[model samples]
Target: SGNIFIKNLDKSIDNKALYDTFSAFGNILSCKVVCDENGSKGYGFVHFETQEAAERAIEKMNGMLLNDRKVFVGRFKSRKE
Candidate 1:
């Protein structure tokens, strides 16, 4: 029921990396690292079943380094309408 936006990821990061990292806080509903022809888009989303876990992850993991790159973890925000 909660989704987090993670950014500033290394180009080599993948779904398994994201899942493995975020899954430490709680059960992950889903984890994905967006990519295209040019490779990783440098961001991803991780879904959690509860807001509590999501919040905890943001608190602990924001600015945490992954694959030598500092990442930003935060609540997912929709684009302005």
Candidate 2:
């Protein structure tokens, strides 16, 4: 298992801000901020190395405010290939 998923962002935020916010709970394996040609879409993904770390991130970051926007954090899922 991996870390939490952060969604519904302001699109103007950057990777450093995401890392800083999530880092409060535990070490982040990777933090990616999704951006378009113009700027950030206010959404992104974060992956911890383990399930425990993910859980901690979820507990701390979910519904947390960042840059005046509330962030949604939880487990990330994907469809079958």
Candidate 3:
């Protein structure tokens, strides 16, 4: 499955913002902002229907400014081989 992995997110980030941010690239299957009982965990996941869409997100959003924050976007990879 092709998905976009975004890390180094702000704790204040939310699903709507994530969706709005990534929506420019392609149709979003789902947008989730990982959080704990306290609030956002400063990480999130974006699911794109296609790899091309995910890659487009990476190309357009990666290292781009988001107000005071800069986002990192890329295709997801497993930690263990």
Q: Which rank order by lDDT, best down to worst? A: 1, 3, 2
How many clashes (backbone N, Cα, C below 3 Å) per candidate?
0, 5, 0
Candidate 2, residues 1-81, lDDT tens digits: the string is 675678887777689877877776666788989887978877888887777778887777789877788889878753247
lDDT computed for candidate 2: 0.78
Give the candidate number with the greatest lDDT: 1
lDDT of each: 0.88, 0.78, 0.82
Cα RMSD of all models vs. native, in order, equals 3.3, 3.6, 2.9
Model 3 earns a TM-score of 0.85
Between candidates 1 and 2, the one scoring higher on TM-score is: 1
> Taking the tens digit of each residue's C-alpha lDDT, what string does model 1 give over 1-81?
579999999988889988988898888988899998988999999999888889889989999878888999888753348
lDDT of 3 at 17: 89
TM-score of each: 0.87, 0.80, 0.85
lDDT, candidate 3, equals 0.82
The digit string of per-residue lDDT tens for model 3 on 1-81 reads: 458878778777799988988888888899899888999887789998877788788878888877677878777863346
